[model samples]
Target: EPAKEARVVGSELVDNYTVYIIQVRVGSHKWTVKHRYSDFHDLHEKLVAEHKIDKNLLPPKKIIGKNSRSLVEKRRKDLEVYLQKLLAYFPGVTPRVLAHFLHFHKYEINGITQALAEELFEKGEQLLQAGEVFEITPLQLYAVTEQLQQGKPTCKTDLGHILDFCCRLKYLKIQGTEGPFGTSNIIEQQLPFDLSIFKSLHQVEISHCDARHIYGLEASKPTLATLSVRFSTTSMKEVLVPVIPTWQALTTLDLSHNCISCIDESVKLIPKIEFLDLSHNELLVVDNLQHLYNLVHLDLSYNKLTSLEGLHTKLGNIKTLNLAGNLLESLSGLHKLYSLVNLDLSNNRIEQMEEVRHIGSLPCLEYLSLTNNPVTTIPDYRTKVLAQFGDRASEVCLDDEVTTQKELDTVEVLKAIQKA
Candidate 1:
């Protein structure tokens, strides 16, 4: 006689109405889209019919009696004990899988412990790739950098070996205070490899590294499309290379939270870039984006922009424009960006509601944010003025305006604030 076939049991709703038993291969994976009990049942029945599963093989429906609730609480306690023991023995495992299991069983674990478990898993992964492993007193990555500074090198050779192993490594993220300094200082002081080793890299993120010695990168033509150097007070102008070899392929470029005060005209080299983020910098004015014709997302938030002159004619394809947290008292330059769909002018000094009337000309506009401005209020008087523009009249608002008088008084205000 043949052995009985192993049955796989699963449940899901069918067509937002009824639940049914679904059986497949024991290890087969499934997904459902139902939200409510009826929806789940409906989808389950549909799945059962579609898969041709025997309905009699389904388990009996569960009842939530008082004793069953008590049994659930007791089982949860037992599960916690079992999990603690499992984790204690099999340390440094993927916690997310365990977390998912626990979550499905209605067990709650500490968030910090789960996070630590994830970190341990990552460390274990690194250990697996390591050529040699040794148990040592734990130290931060930056501690190795401090050792190198004192002429006692430790982790430098290990890091170099890793880099050599992965020659095509592009995105390098060195976190923790000590790791970046050790890596960066080694690249600066001892390594004789061509700076072009990073030529193929599209993005590089270095944080908390001593950036004073970053001059080595200037010798290479960076093929980087997105470069992020953060928490380094050293001026990028001294060590940064401005010329990009291929600008056509570049789309997203982020130079936020850097010490770059003035951007050279060499920035005009990028023609096809769509998203540019230059927020949290010390820029007095943004004048270099005139050549970026394909720019669709521009985030100049948290900058010191007083004039929007360079941005007017070049915003032809821009869909989302963020001028939030600037020093602009007017919205004159934005009138030319008729294709803008989402505009964020929050945290500015806009005082008059009528000044934004010209923005109604943008037919594709959808969402507009004017939060945190000094404008006192919008008025019925201003809404009447906007009505002249038709469909966009009611969308115009003065949530941040000072008063209706300010709108009524500002005629030359619009003329004087026009883009230069």
Candidate 2:
């Protein structure tokens, strides 16, 4: 059975009309659609007129007790039985009218989109085989990957043949389409097929898609270099990654501008991850990333972290770290980043020029930002901050400016007086 079950679950009143809600289950998927009594009558008429199906399968119409609760319930039961029998007749094929009546033509994987995709395959065979860039919407993806044996016309290309051509595409971008009422369909539906079907993928960008779909992309783990999946208005509150070391070839990943609140064990083992952006999230603390030894650039700005207690122990080789616009009050754990070169700690809660001594001892740090911090209000703040670097003070680019002659002389005088 294409549809495992189709039952009239309940009914509701909308615009003074009673509409019955039918819950249809197909394999592991389930969705509900509502239709008034007249809708059922129209469908029955169409089925009988087109295919000569039995008209008596439909329950008799009611003119007087149409709004009565008892009549509605009776009709609901009858509709459920009628739908089951109709679905049973079409064991392997879905008539266009019945598919439309159930709204399957719009959302289901084996419906109208399959026909549309066949037409596209017939027309875009050349583009699919040799194109440098192939952009497709989520619905189109569902169509192209649908089950071919369900009932495709003879000589019509199927999913297997389509993906064979798609294997050569270097770049594939999944663009989200706007649904009716300006809503996003990608948020409501997920890609049922794995992206590993594109065997030669190099770069992939998926926007406005749910983060759970990232798991479908592990097939490209061997050759994929750059992957960006961000800007989900539906709010991806957590970062999810493959458990094994599959992203061995990926170097850059952008997962910024979401509501991710935790950096769990899923991110601990990307061996070749060089640049990772997790900024503009809700992270309070970061841990379990000690294995990312190849990580060079990391962005954790605009989060809710209040401390960097052991960040250096986790990312000792990182060259650039951004921690701006966070809730940090102290730089207690950053001095151990021996390879650190650029650090941004602007717009934080650091006060008391004494805190400068923590990161001032960093030997390789050449660029530092302490702007908008409370310590900036102190007298001779620049001189006091630079004085922490000792002789290397002249090499550090504080805030956004390089050290001036007067500031360098002041640091030299402070150093000589201290030595005396």
Candidate 3:
């Protein structure tokens, strides 16, 4: 039989507190209440049993108070505001200083703490470390300039601090200022900190830093295998500093879009460079590059060069060469490039196709571009002349289009045979 129904048996008064006793059930067995607090325990057991019977039953005690819940919501709102402020100011902070700040303030609170702020800062630093070498953008540069205008001391102008930061850097890029406004005046004062550091850097690009002499290789030398320097100014002499001897390991170098009128004496220092681009300069002559024994690619386009005298001996192993947009009357200097596979001599002053007929000797020469020049106007030029040139002229074009029969048939036979 089911035992007598459990009941609150009695009440005891202790130190003005009243306690009650009651009975509880344990499965098939029934237990008698004895202690004054047993009634409370009996109720808790009954509630749990009821919860098991009906899984949707509400818990006996409240999980949180109104005040506590309100506080949490308030903190969340504050955190959002703090993050927005941090994002606004993030651009002005240096990586090292930002890291230090984040380390000091990060915490695990429900809302933003010094710790959380620090963690966000660390995330940015990790971005810098992960191959995001060109991490700083023009907007950030402007923000930093604004901070300097506000008299902040975040800029590292000292040589020692600059070196310390550079040693830890892996990539660097300096962009030109927008249209005549120029980079902030502070950029000049901080010039020493720009390229001098980061001896281990593998790539460097400088654009529109208009100083007369870019510091030499002593500051960031030898390790760089890829370098690009571009400018809109007409003074190439100011940009090409004495080439450092340690650049023997360089594989690519681009000195385009500048005012350089001559290949300086520094060309001899980078004898092992495989690719060299001297396009869009004001060079009238290009001598002194014969020492580059390993050179495979060369571009001397968009210059004022009228002759290719010394290039024949220097480019013996070259496979690709672009001499477009010059004043050359003939293609004489290319005979020495026995291994050449690609040649571009477009937009020049050549008057006859016979000047380039000797190019058939280059067994590997397959692709050639001769557009926007005088050679394209010859009659029956493509069928009569290029067919005789063999496979070397397979991809050749005088204008943008392939040579037509009408164009080839109209060529003056006399002008085609004129010897250079």
Candidate 4:
């Protein structure tokens, strides 16, 4: 049975509106959440959209007298009754939206812990032994976050309690969904918990969460190999550096879809990083990555990069580099990447044929793309680009297409003329 109870304690006139203070109690733990009448109206609509419940469960709205002390007291009674009936309807597994309205998003943990126990209870009351991957909903995430941050040792059900049971978890995924009262409730906030309770985690993927959540992963530094935290509402400053502890075992890091504008010294934290994805950010220049000699694959597409000034020194070991959808006007710094194999320069602003000359001398170059770039507008562009590779032109894949024998023969003729 769900151990839950709630009541509208009082109402306060704040600013131009009235806020009803709601006190929700669950298993002897109580917390308060304040909301306006419009918030209750919003919750009712959201409930109706997901369930086949009657819409008249809420009190009827009045144009006037909504502010009267006498009228407000009566409405508070009506709202209390509405919450009573709502909680009574779902006793086993409460709906997330309703739970959120009552502050369960921050306090409820037993229900989710029970569900997790069932999933991992491999046999007759025994914890699962093999490696496991698990996911948590946004509400449960908040609940876990709050429990870890403020929970006392006397608390019966808490985050540490549940984590101790999942000792063999290998991967954890937390993705957010739209809330009933909008994003104001779930904006970027610090998480005050350690992610690796047993230190078995090898991967952690979090989306639609604040950069502050990454700080919780410091305990996973020894075993975490892959880390992805995207769709950050804040900048990269909070994502890395002084707040985020160095991840010594991290090899693959994806921080895409963020507001990051610069590559900071935090890149030095992951000394063994091989694959890095910083695409869909606000990068204007590339630097401080020359020390990452082990990095092989890098994705910097869909940014505001206008130059690759020192990329040759920064990414000498990179085999696959994606620079699509940027503002690059030149390829001046790519020729020195002798290990380059596949390159994507699509949808950029490269306008002159001379720009291609920078990358033409790489003996190991095999695939290159110039699609949607102004340089593609040059007459006989394919032959001209292929001619730069000379006898090895046929080995390179241009714009995702294999070189045709006819095109190769045309390039050979162009080379002969240049020799003459």
lDDT of 1 by residue, 38-132 (tens): 33234335435754434443222343566944644443343334334434443433244433332311112122223423443456346435522
> Number of the top candidate by TM-score?
4
Candidate 3 — which residues are off by over 4 angstroms?
Answer: 1-124, 135-165, 178-194, 211-213, 232-244, 391-420
Model 4 stretches with alpha carbons more than 4 Å out: 1-132, 148-161, 179-198, 233-237, 242-245
Residue 184, candidate 2: how far off, in angstroms?
A: 9.4
Model 3 scores a TM of 0.57
Taking all chains together, the TM-score of candidate 2 against the true structure is: 0.66
Writing each residue's lDDT as its tens digit, candidate 3 over 1-420 gives 122223344444667544433333212323333332333334335534643323232223223566954643443343333323333443333233222222211110111122322343455356456866553323223333333344544334332332344566557676655432221123331232224435676776767655343454344556777777787334433443432445645688888888878776666556668988889989898676777778898899999989876567645478888889999887777766778888888889987778766575667776677777787788754554555455444445533456654544444343356432
Q: Write the per-residue lDDT of candidate 2 for residues 60-111, one digit (tens) a residue.
A: 8855564678887888898999999998898665788898787665656666
Estimate the TM-score of every prediction: 0.49, 0.66, 0.57, 0.71
After TM-score superposition, the amount by which residue 54's alpha carbon in candidate 1 deviates from its true location, in angstroms, is 77
